[PDB]
């Protein structure tokens, strides 16, 4: 077969810049195509052979490349173009596809708005509880959350849940699960979730003591 | 408008076999050439084969040559994988996808439908639990649902039947040490709208059949 | 800096059970799988079983069935390893790899990425620490001897990286293993600073300094 | 499942010589076979992947070819970095399976070891036991003769050898032989030498001392 050896694995930029993505054919081919897929949806047609904008693709797309090098160009970077880009050759038996360029929008930073969720007394019942903690529209993605239990350190009973950069405002969401049995749960009063940002000059930290509504 | 959709995604034991269907609508069903493409989450595109709805003349990839097979009901405009002795490393977001010759030679997969989940796993099928993530007394406040102890993916958060939208996130599903899949949705609203307009989630995990509506209340 | 982490090196008796632990750093863990690798003085290289890292189902060879259990615990990017009812046919090094599949799941089983190993000895005998005599000449050497199990650490002084030559140890008659280790001076006027041999056995929280006259 | 055979045994070449390894199987495996370099007390690290694919970082004087059952592997330009041993295995399907490998000496010219010899210490010998080292410094090649002689009598079986790993600088190996006898019989006899045979020496070289302190 014929491997697509994309360039680079991922990349960010700022709105209004001119992004290139290279790709790589094993053997000389004519033309490539390009697929865009978005989080959570299928790979969709960006550009054909050689260089035609499929349906509802704006002008600032655009495929070059001869011999084995091939390119594709966003002249002018807008939010909603984060997401995996695709070469793929067709001159071939089998069709195949480069692994992937992941593009990240980059805009201004932005602190996280943290939530603290206690466990609901309907999930006590079950036997378990779960303390969710939540940190909103923030930019860039790196976030450190820790939790505090009776000012103790917790480490390996807590889960993070990442969102894909936003469309419209390009930020992500965070959330963390903080997982205890009824009965470890029932031993401890204060619950803590310190947030730690790029754009938050000092942690933040959002707490609760059992059962204070 | 041309629209393929995808069925029969789901749990899978290893060794054990599935069958995909596409159905194909808004077009000559028997004018195009429809293919498989696969995609393990996290990872790229994968060419599995290709058929010939007007004659049912097949082409496969040489790796699924064997285990592989690919099948048409023209009269159903309906197209078919069939896998065989599936392993471990056969998880992937199964797609089928339209292809058009615009050209000699020149031709491109101009319509994708939206993929079905294959799940190759030795577990058994759980429904998941719905919680409530009360808001709780800045001009707003944050609410949501765990959706907790579920296998395999996917499940479908929707909030208030579809009618809220914006600023509704629904986390990615995390496999806790369980061996379980868990996530949670949650919506920012104004804090006014709080006592006055209520809130739904709307879950369901077609792999159980379980379709739960969770109204979530301050207290 | 993308790496596999392991464990300690484990001492363990018939019938015990073990579990060794693999964390990732530097990429997305749950985007490539993780295997399992046994190397044995001699034999070496069997591939025991893999994991797909996003459903957490394990792939056993059958030579590795039963007793032998794959897990993983993502929010700690951590791959773990679990022998049961030990076996002294277990001894060996297990190393945890990383799959470097970018483009999908067909082949995975070239291991880009490695971790460091860890080795396990079987058996009944307790932890012996050693005990080190000088190897004086009229070419400096010291004799760490009868210790169990490995390993052992020699170096000189801390910060003498001159023609040292810490050969490999030797399982004798006894059981114990025994090692010199040796090294080279200006072989003339060199007796005027001070040589210590810095000898650590972690298994036995013995740490000895001896100072060649 | 699929078997990986691998040859030679164990090869040596000089620095600047090309090498080959050759490693077949025993099915069918199109292009999915990878190549790996350890130097034991490290992991693996890859070469070659998908038969001809260099990995990350790994020289450009390493190629791979083949398909199907038979495999090579080359290394142009031989360095010292390039000491160790080699394995190849298939990715093609579970169960993966690996090459029973091969294992490479560089070349130096000739070398005469510098052998020394060491009594019993003082302390080992008030604890009841008395173990004689020789050291065999730093030559080439490997193959070495090491015999014990008390007082022109050869010891049997009471000898262990320690070979070190081949230096990733001048490449040249190490020696160590020890002969293990009792307070009690290190008591009783004088002469204790080392007799050391080697490619590099016309006469096999002895090293010898008087019981004790003198």
């Known amino acids: 077969d014929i491997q697509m050896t994309q360039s680079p694995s991922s990349l960010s930029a700022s709105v209004g810049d001119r992004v290139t993505i290279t790709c790589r054919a094993s053997?000389?081919?004519?033309?490539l195509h390009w697929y865009q897929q978005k989080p959570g949806k299928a790979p969709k047609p960006l550009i054909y052979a050689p260089s035609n904008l499929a349906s509802g693709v704006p002008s600032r797309f655009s495929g070059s490349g001869s011999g084995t090098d091939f390119t594709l160009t966003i002249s002018s970077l807008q939010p909603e173009d984060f997401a995996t880009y695709y070469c793929?050759?067709?001159?071939?038996?089998?069709?195949?596809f480069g692994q992937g360029t992941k593009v990240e929008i980059k805009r201004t930073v932005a602190a996280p708005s943290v939530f603290i969720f206690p466990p609901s007394d309907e999930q006590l019942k079950s036997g378990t509880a779960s303390v969710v903690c939540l940190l909103n529209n923030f930019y860039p993605r790196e976030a450190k959350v820790q939790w505090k239990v009776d000012n103790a350190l917790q480490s390996g009973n807590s889960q993070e849940s990442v969102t894909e950069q936003d469309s419209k405002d390009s930020t992500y969401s965070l959330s963390s699960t903080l997982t205890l049995s009824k009965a470890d749960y029932e031993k401890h009063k204060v619950y803590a979730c310190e947030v730690t940002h790029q754009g938050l000059s000092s942690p933040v930290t959002k707490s609760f003591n059992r059962g204070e509504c | 408008e041309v629209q393929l959709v995808e069925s029969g995604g789901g749990l899978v034991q290893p060794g054990g076999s599935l069958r995909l269907s596409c159905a194909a609508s808004g077009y000559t069903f028997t004018s195009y050439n429809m293919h498989w493409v696969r995609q393990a989450p996290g990872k790229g595109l994968e060419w599995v084969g290709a058929?010939?709805?007007?004659?049912?003349?097949?082409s496969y990839n040489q790796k699924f040559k064997g285990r592989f097979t690919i099948s048409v009901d023209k009269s159903k405009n309906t197209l078919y994988l069939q896998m065989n002795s599936l392993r471990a490393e056969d998880t992937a977001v199964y797609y089928c996808?339209?292809?058009?010759?615009?050209?000699?030679?020149?031709?491109?997969?101009?319509?994708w439908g939206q993929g079905t989940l294959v799940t190759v796993s030795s577990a058994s099928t759980k429904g998941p639990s719905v919680f409530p993530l009360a808001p709780s007394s800045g001009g707003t406040a944050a609410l949501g649902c765990l959706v907790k102890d579920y296998f395999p993916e996917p499940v479908t958060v929707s909030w208030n039947s579809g009618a809220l939208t914006s600023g509704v996130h629904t986390f990615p599903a995390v496999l806790q040490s369980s061996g379980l899949y868990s996530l949670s949705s949650v919506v920012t609203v104004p804090s006014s709208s709080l006592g006055t307009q209520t809130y739904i989630c709307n879950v369901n995990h077609k792999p159980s059949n379980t379709k739960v509506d969770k109204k979530v209340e301050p207290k | 800096q993308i790496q596999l982490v392991q464990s300690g090196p484990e001492l363990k008796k018939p019938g015990e059970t073990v579990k060794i632990s693999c964390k990732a750093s530097g990429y997305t863990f749950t985007n490539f799988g993780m295997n399992w690798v046994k190397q044995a003085p001699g034999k070496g290289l069997k591939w025991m079983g893999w994991i797909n890292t996003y459903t957490g189902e394990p792939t056993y060879s059958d030579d590795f069935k039963g007793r032998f259990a794959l897990s993983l615990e993502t929010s700690a990017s951590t791959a773990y390893l679990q022998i049961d009812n030990l076996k002294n046919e277990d001894m060996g090094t297990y190393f945890c790899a990383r799959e470097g599949n970018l483009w999908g799941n067909y082949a995975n089983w070239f291991f880009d990425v490695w971790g460091a190993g860890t080795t396990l000895t079987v058996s009944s005998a307790s932890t012996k620490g050693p005990s080190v005599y000088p190897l004086a000449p009229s070419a400096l050497g010291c004799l760490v001897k009868d210790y169990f199990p490995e390993p052992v650490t020699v170096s000189w002084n801390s910060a003498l990286t001159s023609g040292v030559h810490t050969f490999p140890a030797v399982l004798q008659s006894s059981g114990l293993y025994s090692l010199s280790s040796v090294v080279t001076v200006p072989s003339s006027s060199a007796g005027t600073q001070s040589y210590i041999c810095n000898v650590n056995h972690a298994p036995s929280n013995t740490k000895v300094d001896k100072k060649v006259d | 499942?699929?078997?990986?055979?691998?040859?030679?045994?164990?090869?040596?070449?000089?620095?600047?010589?090309?090498?080959?390894?050759?490693?077949?199987?025993?099915?069918?495996?199109?292009?999915?076979?990878?190549?790996?370099?350890?130097?034991?007390?490290?992991?693996?690290?890859?070469?070659?992947?998908?038969?001809?694919?260099?990995?990350?970082?790994?020289?450009?004087?390493?190629?791979?070819?083949?398909?199907?059952?038979?495999?090579?592997?080359?290394?142009?330009?031989?360095?010292?970095?390039?000491?160790?041993?080699?394995?190849?295995?298939?990715?093609?399907?579970?169960?993966?399976?690996?090459?029973?490998?091969?294992?490479?000496?560089?070349?130096?010219?000739?070398?005469?070891?510098?052998?020394?010899?060491?009594?019993?210490?003082?302390?080992?010998?008030?604890?009841?036991?008395?173990?004689?080292?020789?050291?065999?410094?730093?030559?080439?090649?490997?193959?070495?003769?090491?015999?014990?002689?008390?007082?022109?009598?050869?010891?049997?079986?009471?000898?262990?050898?320690?070979?070190?790993?081949?230096?990733?600088?001048?490449?040249?190996?190490?020696?160590?032989?020890?002969?293990?006898?009792?307070?009690?019989?290190?008591?009783?006899?004088?002469?204790?030498?080392?007799?050391?045979?080697?490619?590099?020496?016309?006469?096999?070289?002895?090293?010898?001392?008087?019981?004790?302190?003198?």
């Open positions: 996808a339209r292809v058009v010759y615009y050209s000699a030679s020149y031709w491109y997969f101009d319509v």
């Open positions: 053997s000389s081919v004519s033309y």
């Open positions: 793929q050759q067709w001159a071939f038996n089998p069709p195949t």
């Open positions: 058929i010939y709805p007007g004659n049912g003349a097949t």
